[PDB]
Amino acid sequence: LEASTEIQRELDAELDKLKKMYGGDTADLSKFPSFHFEDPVVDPINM
Amino acid sequence: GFEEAITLEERAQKSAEAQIMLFQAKRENVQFQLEAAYRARLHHVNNEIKKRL
Amino acid sequence: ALVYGQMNEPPGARARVALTGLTVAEYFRDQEGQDVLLFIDNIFRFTQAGSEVSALLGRIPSAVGYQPTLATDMGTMQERITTTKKGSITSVQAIYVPADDLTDPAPATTFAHLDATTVLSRAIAELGIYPAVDPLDSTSRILDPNIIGEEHYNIARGVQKILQDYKSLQDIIAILGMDELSEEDKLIVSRARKIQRFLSQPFQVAEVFTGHAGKLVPIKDTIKGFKMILNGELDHLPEVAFYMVGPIEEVVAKAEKIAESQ
Amino acid sequence: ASKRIARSSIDWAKMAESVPESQKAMYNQFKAKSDGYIRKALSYPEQPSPINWEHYRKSLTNPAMVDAFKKQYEALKVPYPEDKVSSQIDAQEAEAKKEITKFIQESRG
């Protein structure tokens, strides 16, 4: 209610900084993220 | 020389038995590596959930 | 951005010039979220101007002629140089040591807030290595396997150990020679020469005066390159291939060009 | 859990009593490379950090997000990874059994 411009600017700057820090630009963090199991290649048992 | 040759054949047979132990340790190590990769993906999921919170 | 409080100024202006530059840096940090750099030259002139201001006010001077508020004046100037939740200000300060005494109150007060050290050596500049940073005199407090990582710490310790062995063997080589050294000592002195050659680097801001294109080597490239030299993976390359070269791929490329030109 | 990752191994004591050093110097790798799979086994547990949902309920005005994330975390379970090296190891074991039988026959002769 009747907030000043500088407080709104600082809020937007902090929200953008946290979104970039927490990686919110890549995907929406408010939802459940999906995961992929990186398919494993074991060491060669044979020579 | 004949007695030493007999004992060396016995050592060769024991080497074959320990080769069986090697193959069992090989399949155990593969299961250990697969389970450890499962633990890392569980850790990665929990870390992502903590990051969302 | 420059401030340049001159030496003919009154002591008040020379005392507040560092605060003026810190204020410009604080705007760049707080209102932009940047990792600002602040350069202070000199930081001993800041202490001397503060001492002259306090002596003009008639206050009783402290030990070795300094102001009694030297520790808190340094503290108030230096505690604004920190990392906050918006940004950070990193300060590189030129330090003059009066009468070559590190226990003097002004260097001892300055060293409490220091997080690193970069010593520019005249002897290294005589060897043609640029930048002439002394690898053994320069130290940092973040050399720990929790801030920079295990691999960075181990490689830096290995490089320091090899250079210390080289400095120990330099006197032996100077008084006797190099032929009587063992194979291990010859391998150590060859790797140390390649390590101290790889520390040199071309700078972009001097690329007009040098003719070499400047390089910005990422930290992982320096880590990988010094790990390769430490393990003896480049024992067959000549030492001159390591001189004035940023990465290690350009080291092996320069070595290939040397071999082809030979 | 941490059963077949953290608190299990294979007895190397009987392994070192047969290997003829330079003939089987790969055992020095085998005791070491598998130790790497023990070193990462020192890390990597099942649940590395349980989530204190009560702390997030107290630290947030609206605890419905905490309950939703707890329900999503309980609704997801990762199973054990797929395997395709079991048949290869069994084939190597069978070939080893045939070669051991042949070598035992030659030793008997």
Instruction: Give C77-129 as a 3 state SS string.
Output: HHCCCCECCCCEEEEEECCCCHHHCCCCHHHHHHCCCCCECCCECHHHHHCCC
Of C79, C87, C21, C9, the C-alpha closest to C48 is C9
Q: Which two tokens stand for residue C59?
A: 């206050």
Residues of A in contact with D69 (CB under 8 A): 32
Min Cα separation B51/chain D (Å): 11
Is D81 within 8 Å of A46 when comparing Cβ atoms? Answer: no
Min Cα separation C83/chain A (Å): 15
Asked if D touches A (at least 3 Cβ pairs < 8 angstroms), the answer reads yes
3-state secondary structure of B37: helix
D35 contacts B27 by C-beta, under 8 angstroms? no
Task: Give the DSSP H or E segment for C36.
Answer: strand C35-40
Q: Is C260 exposed, middle or buried (0-12, 13-18, 19+ CB in 10 A)?
A: exposed
C89 contacts C25 by C-beta, under 8 angstroms? yes
3-state secondary structure of B23: helix
Task: Quickly count: other Cβ atoms within 10 Å of residue C28's Cβ.
Answer: 18
Resolution (Å) of this entry: 2.7
**Cα dist. C71→C13, C113, C182 in Å?**
20, 11, 53
Residue in chain B lying closest to A22 (CA) = B51
Helices (H), D1-109: 26-42, 53-59, 64-75, 86-108
3-state secondary structure of B27: helix
How far is Cα B36 from Cα D42, in angstroms, rounded to an integer? 9
Task: Quickly count: other Cβ atoms within 10 Å of residue C197's Cβ.
Answer: 21
How was this entry determined? cryo-EM
How far is Cα C191 from Cα C230, in angstroms, rounded to an integer? 7
Q: Which two tokens stand for residue C222?
A: 């320096």
